[PDB]
Amino acid sequence: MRTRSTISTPNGITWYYEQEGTGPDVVLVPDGLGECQMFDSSVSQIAAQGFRVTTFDMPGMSRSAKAPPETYTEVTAQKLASYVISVLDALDIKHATVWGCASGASTVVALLLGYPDRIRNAMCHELPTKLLDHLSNTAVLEDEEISKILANVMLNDVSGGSEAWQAMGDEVHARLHKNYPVWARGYPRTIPPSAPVKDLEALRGKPLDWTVGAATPTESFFDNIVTATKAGVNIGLLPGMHFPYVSHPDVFAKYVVETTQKHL
Amino acid sequence: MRTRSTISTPNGITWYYEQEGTGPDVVLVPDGLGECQMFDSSVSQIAAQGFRVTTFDMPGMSRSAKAPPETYTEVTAQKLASYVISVLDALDIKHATVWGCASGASTVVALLLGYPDRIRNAMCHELPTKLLDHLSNTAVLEDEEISKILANVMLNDVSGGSEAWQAMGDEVHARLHKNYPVWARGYPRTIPPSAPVKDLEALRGKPLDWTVGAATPTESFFDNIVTATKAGVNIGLLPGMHFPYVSHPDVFAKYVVETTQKHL
Numbered sequence: 128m129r130t131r132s133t134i135s136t137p138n139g140i141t142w143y144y145e146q147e148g149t150g151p152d153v154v155l156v157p158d159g160l161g162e163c164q165m166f167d168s169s170v171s172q173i174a175a176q177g178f179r180v181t182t183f184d185m186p187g188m189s190r191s192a193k194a195p196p197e198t199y200t201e202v203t204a205q206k207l208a209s210y211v212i213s214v215l216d217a218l219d220i221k222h223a224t225v226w227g228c229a230s231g232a233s234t235v236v237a238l239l240l241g242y243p244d245r246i247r248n249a250m251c252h253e254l255p256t257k258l259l260d261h262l263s264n265t266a267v268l269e270d271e272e273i274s275k276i277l278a279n280v281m282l283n284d285v286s287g288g289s290e291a292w293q294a295m296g297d298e299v300h301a302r303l304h305k306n307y308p309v310w311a312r313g314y315p316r317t318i319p320p321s322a323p324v325k326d327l328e329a330l331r332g333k334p335l336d337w338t339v340g341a342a343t344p345t346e347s348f349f350d351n352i353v354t355a356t357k358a359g360v361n362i363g364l365l366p367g368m369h370f371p372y373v374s375h376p377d378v379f380a381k382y383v384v385e386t387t388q389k390h391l
Numbered sequence: 392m393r394t395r396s397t398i399s400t401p402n403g404i405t406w407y408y409e410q411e412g413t414g415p416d417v418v419l420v421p422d423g424l425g426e427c428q429m430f431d432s433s434v435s436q437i438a439a440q441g442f443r444v445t446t447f448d449m450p451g452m453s454r455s456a457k458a459p460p461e462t463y464t465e466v467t468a469q470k471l472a473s474y475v476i477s478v479l480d481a482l483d484i485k486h487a488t489v490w491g492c493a494s495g496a497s498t499v500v501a502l503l504l505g506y507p508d509r510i511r512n513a514m515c516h517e518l519p520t521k522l523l524d525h526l527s528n529t530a531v532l533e534d535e536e537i538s539k540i541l542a543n544v545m546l547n548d549v550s551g552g553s554e555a556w557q558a559m560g561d562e563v564h565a566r567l568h569k570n571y572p573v574w575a576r577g578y579p580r581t582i583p584p585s586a587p588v589k590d591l592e593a594l595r596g597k598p599l600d601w602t603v604g605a606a607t608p609t610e611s612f613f614d615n616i617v618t619a620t621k622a623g624v625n626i627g628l629l630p631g632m633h634f635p636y637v638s639h640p641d642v643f644a645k646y647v648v649e650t651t652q653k654h655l
């Protein structure tokens with residue numbers, strides 16, 4: 128039985144969250160678009176090994192839109208990590224395995240470095256380190272135009288699995304539509320300079336497992352592979368591209384349970 | 392004026408070779424398909440910055456087909472390296488910068504390690520280190536069936552630049568047609584286990600500059616990035632995928648001259 132509910136933290140945010148299972152805590156942090164329906168299948172799968180899976184829409188996005196604008200403007204890994212630690216406190220999750228991709232990747236590594244006693248271990252996927260003008264220049268377009276462009280970027284380039292993407296259904300895509308603009312204005316300019324990955328030595332030794340999409344063009348996260356390898360951090364691949372939990376749930380959920388298990 | 396000619400070495404091979412310019416020697420080693428017409432524009436471009444550019448069809452391929460079958464069966468970075476040293480001796484090129492992609496990549500690093508006094512510096516691009524069953528399974532499969540399949544792999548997947556690929560013209564494609572089978576039977580099984588990169592400490596400090604295609608799926612040479620990074624070897628990207636000298640001559644030639652100049 129999945130809990131589907133809301134909970135409020137004292138930084139102004141009213142979070143939509145979901146939760147399934149009994150066991151050590153695994154937390155699935157969404158990517159930029161902040162939409163936790165993307166995890167729905169994997170939540171059940173991971174929970175059926177013995178875990179309590181929690182996930183949530185991110186502040187300003189989908190059903191967690193009731194939040195103050197500092198929460199979704201000029202966003203940074205550090206800020207997102209603050210927010211995630213606040214919803215974790217509210218749900219009395221003391222010790223969590225965490226996953227996160229893209230801005231979620233940034234967020235979990237910043238969790239891992241900033242709050243070592245709270246994070247059993249962290250899985251980051253395709254952590255953004257470089258600015259990226261095609262994305263960034265959409266911020267100053269009108270809402271709606273942005274939605275047309277970003278919707279299309281997600282669909283054709285970057286799911287790694289376009290059928291699966293579309294199959295999320297009309298509701299989810301209606302929520303994403305409203306999300307694109309807030310993301311375009313809040314994330315692409317400011318997330319990458321915040322990357323907590325410039326201090327190689329702080330990564331060394333940490334319980335961190337880093338991945339990239341197998342199908343993703345080598346240029347997109349070449350830097351993740353260089354950085355991880357210099358820092359001794361475990362790195363490898365998942366199938367697809369930027370959303371392994373949409374395109375390849377079964378392998379995604381396997382990878383999460385299997386990696387969590389290593390750090391118990 | 393380009394020299395277009397042949398020369399014979401005492402290991403049975405009659406090489407077709409080309410050469411343009413005066414200066415330090417830069418040698419362009421073809422990829423598996425062994426066909427040096429692919430360099431034609433770059434040969435001129437590199438030569439005009441003051442170098443003597445040599446290139447050649449590889450043994451058993453295109454216009455260097457008069458060669459004994461041990462030169463194109465059960466091929467191997469070490470073998471290919473001896474062959475290229477032999478055509479270098481015949482042409483009295485005493486010191487060369489070398490470039491190579493794919494099996495050429497394997498060949499140039501074996502040159503660099505085996506013959507340090509002959510190699511000013513080496514540029515390797517997408518070095519094969521894994522077996523690869525879709526390729527390998529073509530070996531047992533009719534000369535002309537293999538040419539259909541491999542011609543189509545090259546066209547659609549892996550030029551990185553399909554218009555440029557086709558524009559090489561019918562002549563070169565007729566030569567390639569005959570080449571695909573020889574390659575399929577001689578290269579994919581045996582080149583990768585010969586990869587001279589399993590000794591990281593031999594790479595360290597050497598004048599080696601390694602690249603991968605920006606557009607190439609991350610999985611294809613993820614390992615090249617790990618290895619280079621562990622060995623302190625210079626690594627980065629060129630545009631396109633597996634043939635940057637077909638798809639992006641101007642930036643290829645720029646990369647070759649600029650890199651040669653660093654070691655010059």
Ligand SMILES: C[C@H]1CCC[C@H](O)CCC/C=C/c2cc(O)cc(O)c2C(=O)O1
Pocket residue numbers: 158159160228229230231255280281285314315316318319369
């Ligand atoms: C939403 C997700 C979309 C990935 C597909 C993107 O369209 C493909 C480009 C990858 C960019 C990811 C990204 C960059 C950035 O600076 C900040 C971000 O929050 C993200 C990110 O979360 O990208």
Ligand SMILES: C[C@H]1CCC[C@H](O)CCC/C=C/c2cc(O)cc(O)c2C(=O)O1
Pocket residue numbers: 422423424492493494495519544545548549578579580582583633
């Ligand atoms: C011919 C060239 C282009 C084919 C790229 C292929 O379409 C992409 C596969 C990349 C590796 C190719 C390759 C593997 C190998 O074991 C030996 C080789 O000589 C090659 C190689 O030369 O690939």
